[PDB]
C-alpha cells in the first residue's frame, strides 16, 4: 500500500517544480494517517486557480458538484470508489502526496484514461516467440514526444467536450485517418485501476481502463494501410513499434502498466 | 566571448524584507547589491520573485591566482540560475577547451567542519590521485572551506602540490552561491579579462566562508542571497546532468557521459541532494564509518523495507549539536525516513563503502561499482547496460570483476557486443580480458573485418 505516490512525491516537476512536503512511506494514505503538517495550495500553472476558463472544472468555494453525479461539462468520475471530496477539494485515496491542490492536470481529479493498447505479438523472419525463455515477444506502436525524451501513449482522458478516447484523439486521427472507428469493439478490456502520475496531488489522481486489441494473428494487423493509417506527417514525429523490456523511454509511464500485459498474454516484458 | 551570453540574477537588496537580525545593515544595507534599482522603482514593495531579479553581461570572467597560498591558473564564473545548462557548455568545452568527462564524480556534503580518520583521509585521498590521471574525466567539487568541501581540495591538493601531474589533471570544478561567499571584492574587475589576485581567508569576513585549498574552476550562482546556504542543487541536478545526457562524440561505441555521487558528512540539502538524484539515476557511494549523511544511510542501505520512525539510528550520529533523541531540536523525524527508504528501495544505485574490508575491496574501482550496477537495470534491448558498463571494467585491469559482474548476469553472451570492447582490451594490453573474451570465445575471423584491422592498425604502441 505504500506505492500509491512513488512518482507523485517527486522534487522536480518540469511545469511547476513544488513538492515541499513529503509524506513517509509508512504514512502513505491520509485516511490512516499522512501527518498532522500540510503542503500549501496553489499550483494552477496556466490560467487561474480554479476558474480555469479553458478547463472548467469548478472552483473550491463554490462547491464540488457532486462527484457522482454526471455533474455538467465535465465528468471526474472514476473506477475508483472513494472520489473523497472533504474540504471543497478531492482528496484521493492514494493519500496526501504533499501537493498543493492542482487543476494543470486540466480536470481538477481527471480520474481516467485509456491508452492505445495496440497488442500485437511480435515474431521473426517466419514466426517464432521469445525463446528469451519461453514466452512470447510483444510490439506495441508508442509514439515518441518530440521534445521529452520519452515515448509515449496518449491518454483516452476525456477532451473537454468530447468522450473518452477523444483526448486520444488529440493524436489518433490527426494523422489523417476518419474510417475506422471500431477501436475498443474489437477490443478486449485488461486493467481498471490508479496508475501514480508524477503530478498527482491529494486533489488530483489519474486512474486507467486498459483495452487489448491483440494482434496474435499477425498478418490482418492494423498498419498504415490495413485497417488504419497514421502517416506521422504533420503531427507524428516518431510512433514505431516497441518490443517489450524494462527500461524502454515510457519510464515512470505506461511502462508500469505492460506488466499486467504480459500477465495476460505471456509476453516477456 | 561568453562575456555578454553569460548573465547575472541580482537584485537590489535592501528596498524590502525586513529580516533586520543581520547587525552591520538594515537588511543587508547599500554600497552593495543596490547598484541599478539604487533609485526609487515603481513600487518595490516585495523583494519576491516579483521584484525581478535582474542580469546583465558578466564581469567576474578571468583568472585569480592566491595571493599567498596557490600559483595555478584558474578561471571562475559568476553566472545566472535559471539559464539553461547549453551556453556553459561552450564556455567549458570551447572557451575553457576542457576534455570530453569521462565520468562525473559529484562530491557532496554540509557546513559541518569534520574531520575523519587519517586511515580513511588516506584511503580515500589515495583513491582519487589514480582515478582521474587515468582517466582525465571531470570532478564536481564544491567550493566553500566550512565542511566537506573544505575536504575535498586536500585531496586536490595531493594532487596539485605532490602528485603534480598536468598529464592528466584533473577538473575540479567547485560551484559557490553568490551571496554565501566571503568575498564581493576582488571580482568586479569590469575588463572581462583579469589575471587577479586575492586571499582564501576562511576567517576573512567569518560570518560567510571562503573556498577550499585547491579546486580547478569556481561557478558563482546568484540570487541576491546572503550567507543562505543550500544554493546548488537547482544546479547541481541540471547542469551536471545536462553533461551527463550529453554522449561522447565517438570512440568504440558513443557512450553517454556517466555520473557517480560521493557523500562524506552532510545534513538537509545534502539528503535532499543525494535521493533525488538517485531518482534521476545518479548512483552514489556512501563512506560508512564517517558521515552525517553518509554514516546513518550506509548502515541500512543493505536492509529491506522496514520503519523503525527513526528512533535508533536518529542519533547515531555525528558530534551531536542539540545533543540528545529528545532535545535535538531537528523536526520532520518519520518525514525523514522516506528520504533514506527511497535510496533503501533503489537497489542498484547503491554501493556501501565499509571500514573493514571495502578499502580492501579496491576503492580505485569500488566508487565504479555503483555504476556497474545502476547501469545493471538498463535493459531495452539497447546496450546501454552492456557496452556503456564494458568501457569502465577494462580501464582497471579489473578481469575477475568483470567475469563477476556481466558474466555471472544473464548475459545476453552478445559476440558483436564483446568486440567494441575486444578491441578496448587490445589497445592497451589487458592480457585475462582477451582471455576472458577467448574463454567467453570471441570467433576471431569474425571479429576480424578489414576495418578492424584497419582501426587495429591505427592504434599501434
Same mark, same amino acid.
Given at each position: 500500500?505504500?506505492?500509491?505516490?512513488?512518482?507523485?512525491?517527486?522534487?522536480?516537476?518540469?511545469?511547476?517544480?513544488?513538492?515541499?512536503?513529503?509524506?513517509?512511506?509508512?504514512?502513505?494514505?491520509?485516511?490512516?494517517?499522512?501527518?498532522?503538517?500540510?503542503?500549501?495550495?496553489?499550483?494552477?500553472?496556466?490560467?487561474?486557480?480554479?476558474?480555469?476558463?479553458?478547463?472548467?472544472?469548478?472552483?473550491?468555494?463554490?462547491?464540488?458538484?457532486?462527484?457522482?453525479?454526471?455533474?455538467?461539462?465535465?465528468?471526474?468520475?472514476?473506477?475508483?470508489?472513494?472520489?473523497?471530496?472533504?474540504?471543497?477539494?478531492?482528496?484521493?485515496?492514494?493519500?496526501?502526496?504533499?501537493?498543493?491542490?492542482?487543476?494543470?492536470?486540466?480536470?481538477?481529479?481527471?480520474?481516467?484514461?485509456?491508452?492505445?493498447?495496440?497488442?500485437?505479438?511480435?515474431?521473426?523472419?517466419?514466426?517464432?516467440?521469445?525463446?528469451?525463455?519461453?514466452?512470447?515477444?510483444?510490439?506495441?506502436?508508442?509514439?515518441?514526444?518530440?521534445?521529452?525524451?520519452?515515448?509515449?501513449?496518449?491518454g483516452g482522458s476525456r477532451e473537454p467536450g468530447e468522450m473518452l478516447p477523444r483526448k486520444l484523439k488529440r493524436i489518433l486521427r490527426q494523422e489523417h485517418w476518419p474510417s475506422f472507428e471500431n477501436l475498443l469493439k474489437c477490443g478486449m478490456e485488461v486493467y481498471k485501476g490508479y496508475m501514480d502520475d508524477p503530478r498527482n496531488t491529494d486533489n488530483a489522481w489519474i486512474e486507467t481502463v486498459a483495452v487489448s486489441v491483440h494482434f496474435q494473428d499477425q498478418n490482418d494487423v492494423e498498419l498504415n494501410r490495413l485497417n488504419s493509417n497514421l502517416?506521422?506527417?504533420?503531427?507524428?514525429?516518431?510512433?514505431?513499434?516497441?518490443?517489450?523490456?524494462?527500461?524502454?523511454?515510457?519510464?515512470?509511464?505506461?511502462?508500469?502498466?505492460?506488466?499486467?500485459?504480459?500477465?495476460?498474454?505471456?509476453?516477456?516484458? | 566571448?561568453?562575456?555578454?551570453?553569460?548573465?547575472?540574477?541580482?537584485?537590489?537588496?535592501?528596498?524590502?524584507?525586513?529580516?533586520?537580525?543581520?547587525?552591520?545593515?538594515?537588511?543587508?544595507?547599500?554600497?552593495?547589491?543596490?547598484?541599478?534599482?539604487?533609485?526609487?522603482?515603481?513600487?518595490?514593495?516585495?523583494?519576491?520573485?516579483?521584484?525581478?531579479?535582474?542580469?546583465?553581461?558578466?564581469?567576474?570572467?578571468?583568472?585569480?591566482?592566491? +595571493? %599567498?597560498?596557490?600559483?595555478? *591558473?584558474?578561471?571562475? #564564473? @559568476?553566472?545566472?540560475?535559471?539559464?539553461? /545548462?547549453?551556453?556553459?557548455?561552450?564556455?567549458?568545452?570551447?572557451?575553457?577547451?576542457?576534455?570530453?568527462?569521462?565520468?562525473?564524480?559529484?562530491?557532496?556534503?554540509?557546513?559541518?567542519?569534520?574531520?575523519?580518520?587519517?586511515?580513511?583521509?588516506?584511503?580515500?585521498?589515495?583513491?582519487?590521485?589514480?582515478?582521474?590521471?587515468?582517466?582525465?574525466?571531470?570532478?564536481?567539487?564544491?567550493?566553500?572551506? +566550512? %565542511?566537506?568541501?573544505?575536504? *575535498?581540495?586536500?585531496? #586536490? @591538493?595531493?594532487?596539485?602540490?605532490?602528485? /603534480?601531474?598536468?598529464?592528466?589533471?584533473?577538473?575540479?570544478?567547485?560551484?559557490?552561491?553568490?551571496?554565501?561567499?566571503?568575498?564581493?571584492?576582488?571580482?568586479?574587475?569590469?575588463?572581462?579579462?583579469?589575471?587577479?589576485?586575492?586571499?582564501?581567508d576562511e576567517d576573512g569576513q567569518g560570518n560567510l566562508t571562503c573556498l577550499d585549498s585547491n579546486h580547478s574552476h569556481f561557478i558563482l550562482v546568484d540570487d541576491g542571497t546572503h550567507g543562505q546556504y543550500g544554493v546548488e542543487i537547482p544546479l547541481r541536478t541540471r547542469l551536471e546532468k545536462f553533461i551527463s545526457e550529453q554522449t561522447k562524440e565517438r570512440g568504440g561505441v558513443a557512450i553517454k557521459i556517466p555520473i557517480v555521487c560521493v557523500v562524506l558528512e552532510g545534513g538537509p540539502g545534502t539528503l535532499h541532494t543525494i535521493d533525488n538524484?538517485?531518482?534521476?539515476?545518479?548512483?552514489?557511494?556512501?563512506?560508512?564509518?564517517?558521515?552525517?549523511?553518509?554514516?546513518?544511510?550506509?548502515?541500512?542501505?543493505?536492509?529491506?523495507?522496514?520503519?523503525?520512525?527513526?528512533?535508533?539510528?536518529?542519533?547515531?550520529?555525528?558530534?551531536?549539536?542539540?545533543?540528545?533523541?529528545?532535545?535535538?531540536?531537528?523536526?520532520?523525524?518519520?518525514?525523514?525516513?522516506?528520504?533514506?527508504?527511497?535510496?533503501?528501495?533503489?537497489?542498484?544505485?547503491?554501493?556501501?563503502?565499509?571500514?573493514?574490508?571495502?578499502?580492501?575491496?579496491?576503492?580505485?574501482?569500488?566508487?565504479?561499482?555503483?555504476?556497474?550496477?545502476?547501469?545493471?537495470?538498463?535493459?531495452?534491448?539497447?546496450?546501454?547496460?552492456?557496452?556503456?558498463?564494458?568501457?569502465?571494467?577494462?580501464?582497471?585491469?579489473?578481469?575477475?570483476?568483470?567475469?563477476?559482474?556481466?558474466?555471472?548476469?544473464?548475459?545476453?553472451?552478445?559476440?558483436?557486443?564483446?568486440?567494441?570492447?575486444?578491441?578496448?582490451?587490445?589497445?592497451?594490453?589487458?592480457?585475462?580480458?582477451?582471455?576472458?573474451?577467448?574463454?567467453?570465445?570471441?570467433?576471431?575471423?569474425?571479429?576480424?573485418?578489414?576495418?578492424?584491422?584497419?582501426?587495429?592498425?591505427?592504434?599501434?604502441?
Amino acid at each position: 500500500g505504500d506505492s500509491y505516490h512513488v512518482n507523485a512525491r517527486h522534487l522536480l516537476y518540469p511545469n511547476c517544480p513544488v513538492t515541499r512536503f513529503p509524506v513517509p512511506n509508512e504514512k502513505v494514505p491520509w485516511e490512516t494517517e499522512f501527518l498532522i503538517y500540510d503542503p500549501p495550495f496553489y499550483t494552477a500553472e496556466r490560467k487561474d486557480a480554479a476558474a480555469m476558463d479553458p478547463m472548467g472544472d469548478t472552483l473550491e468555494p463554490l462547491s464540488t458538484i457532486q462527484y457522482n453525479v454526471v455533474d455538467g461539462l465535465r465528468d471526474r468520475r472514476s473506477f475508483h470508489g472513494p472520489y473523497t471530496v472533504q474540504a471543497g477539494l478531492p482528496l484521493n485515496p492514494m493519500g496526501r502526496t504533499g501537493l498543493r491542490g492542482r487543476g494543470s492536470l486540466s480536470c481538477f481529479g481527471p480520474n481516467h484514461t485509456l491508452y492505445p493498447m495496440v497488442t500485437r505479438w511480435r515474431r521473426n523472419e517466419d514466426g517464432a516467440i521469445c525463446r528469451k525463455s519461453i514466452k512470447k515477444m510483444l510490439e506495441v506502436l508508442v509514439v515518441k514526444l518530440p521534445l521529452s525524451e520519452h515515448w509515449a501513449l496518449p491518454g483516452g482522458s476525456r477532451e473537454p467536450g468530447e468522450m473518452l478516447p477523444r483526448k486520444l484523439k488529440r493524436i489518433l486521427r490527426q494523422e489523417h485517418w476518419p474510417s475506422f472507428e471500431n477501436l475498443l469493439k474489437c477490443g478486449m478490456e485488461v486493467y481498471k485501476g490508479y496508475m501514480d502520475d508524477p503530478r498527482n496531488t491529494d486533489n488530483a489522481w489519474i486512474e486507467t481502463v486498459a483495452v487489448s486489441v491483440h494482434f496474435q494473428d499477425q498478418n490482418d494487423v492494423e498498419l498504415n494501410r490495413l485497417n488504419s493509417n497514421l502517416h506521422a506527417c504533420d503531427s507524428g514525429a516518431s510512433i514505431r513499434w516497441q518490443v517489450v523490456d524494462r527500461r524502454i523511454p515510457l519510464y515512470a509511464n505506461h511502462k508500469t502498466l505492460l506488466q499486467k500485459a504480459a500477465a495476460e498474454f505471456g509476453a516477456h516484458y | 566571448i561568453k562575456k555578454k551570453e553569460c548573465v547575472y540574477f541580482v537584485e537590489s537588496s535592501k528596498l524590502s524584507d525586513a529580516g533586520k537580525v543581520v547587525c552591520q545593515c538594515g537588511y543587508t544595507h547599500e554600497q552593495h547589491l543596490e547598484e541599478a534599482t539604487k533609485p526609487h522603482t515603481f513600487q518595490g514593495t516585495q523583494w519576491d520573485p516579483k521584484k525581478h531579479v535582474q542580469e546583465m553581461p558578466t564581469d567576474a570572467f578571468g583568472d585569480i591566482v592566491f +595571493t %599567498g597560498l596557490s600559483q595555478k *591558473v584558474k578561471k571562475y #564564473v @559568476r553566472v545566472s540560475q535559471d539559464t539553461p /545548462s547549453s551556453v556553459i557548455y561552450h564556455l567549458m568545452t570551447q572557451h575553457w577547451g576542457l576534455d570530453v568527462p569521462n565520468l562525473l564524480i559529484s562530491v557532496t556534503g554540509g557546513a559541518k567542519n569534520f574531520n575523519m580518520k587519517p586511515r580513511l583521509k588516506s584511503i580515500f585521498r589515495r583513491g582519487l590521485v589514480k582515478v582521474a590521471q587515468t582517466t582525465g574525466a571531470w570532478i564536481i567539487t564544491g567550493g566553500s572551506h +566550512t %565542511g566537506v568541501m573544505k575536504q *575535498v581540495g586536500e585531496a #586536490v @591538493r595531493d594532487f596539485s602540490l605532490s602528485s /603534480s601531474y598536468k598529464e592528466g589533471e584533473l577538473i575540479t570544478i567547485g560551484v559557490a552561491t553568490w551571496g554565501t561567499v566571503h568575498r564581493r571584492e576582488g571580482l568586479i574587475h569590469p575588463t572581462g579579462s583579469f589575471p587577479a589576485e586575492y586571499i582564501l581567508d576562511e576567517d576573512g569576513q567569518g560570518n560567510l566562508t571562503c573556498l577550499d585549498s585547491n579546486h580547478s574552476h569556481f561557478i558563482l550562482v546568484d540570487d541576491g542571497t546572503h550567507g543562505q546556504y543550500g544554493v546548488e542543487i537547482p544546479l547541481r541536478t541540471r547542469l551536471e546532468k545536462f553533461i551527463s545526457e550529453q554522449t561522447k562524440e565517438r570512440g568504440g561505441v558513443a557512450i553517454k557521459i556517466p555520473i557517480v555521487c560521493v557523500v562524506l558528512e552532510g545534513g538537509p540539502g545534502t539528503l535532499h541532494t543525494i535521493d533525488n538524484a538517485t531518482t534521476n539515476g545518479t548512483p552514489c557511494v556512501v563512506v560508512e564509518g564517517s558521515g552525517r549523511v553518509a554514516d546513518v544511510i550506509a548502515q541500512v542501505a543493505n536492509l529491506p523495507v522496514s520503519d523503525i520512525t527513526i528512533s535508533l539510528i536518529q542519533q547515531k550520529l555525528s558530534v551531536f549539536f542539540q545533543e540528545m533523541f529528545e532535545t535535538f531540536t531537528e523536526s520532520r523525524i518519520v518525514e525523514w525516513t522516506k528520504k533514506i527508504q527511497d535510496i533503501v528501495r533503489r537497489r542498484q544505485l547503491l554501493t556501501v563503502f565499509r571500514e573493514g574490508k571495502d578499502g580492501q575491496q579496491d576503492v580505485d574501482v569500488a566508487i565504479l561499482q555503483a555504476l556497474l550496477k545502476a547501469s545493471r537495470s538498463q535493459d531495452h534491448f539497447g546496450h546501454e547496460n552492456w557496452d556503456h558498463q564494458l568501457k569502465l571494467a577494462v580501464a582497471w585491469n579489473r578481469v575477475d570483476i568483470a567475469r563477476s559482474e556481466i558474466f555471472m548476469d544473464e548475459w545476453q553472451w552478445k559476440p558483436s557486443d564483446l568486440h567494441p570492447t575486444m578491441t578496448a582490451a587490445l589497445i592497451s594490453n589487458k592480457p585475462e580480458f582477451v582471455k576472458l573474451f577467448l574463454e567467453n570465445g570471441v570467433q576471431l575471423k569474425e571479429f576480424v573485418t578489414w576495418d578492424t584491422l584497419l582501426y587495429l592498425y591505427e592504434n599501434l604502441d
